[PDB]
Design a protein around this ligand. Sequence first.
Ligand SMILES: [Zn+2]
Ligand SMILES: [Zn+2]
Lengths: 58, 58
Amino acid sequence: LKCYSSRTETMTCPEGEDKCEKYAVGLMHGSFFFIYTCTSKCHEGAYNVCCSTDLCNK
Amino acid sequence: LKCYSSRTETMTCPEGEDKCEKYAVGLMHGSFFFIYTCTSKCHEGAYNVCCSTDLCNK
Ligand SMILES: [Zn+2]
Ligand SMILES: [Zn+2]
């Protein structure tokens, strides 16, 4: 499985991490930033992206 | 297992994630910040922390 690991960067996930996710975190003063990663369990949230097809996390 | 999920919050990890980590993510122009999370596999990086005990990722 291949996932985005940032806005533009891409990697092959390590064993046991079968999902891509894209989730936002707070930065400062109401700004937010996206975190792109391979994972075994997706962070839950109302707008999180969680999927298992290549480069599906944006 | 329990980990920091940010600088000020903590959570009990979902079953299937038996590590805590703090790992570096780039922001802009050389600035960076840390992401705190449960994981099954730690992100590689010279500034990252990968551990297996309650709240160990700070
Ligand atoms: Zn400020
Ligand atoms: Zn700039």
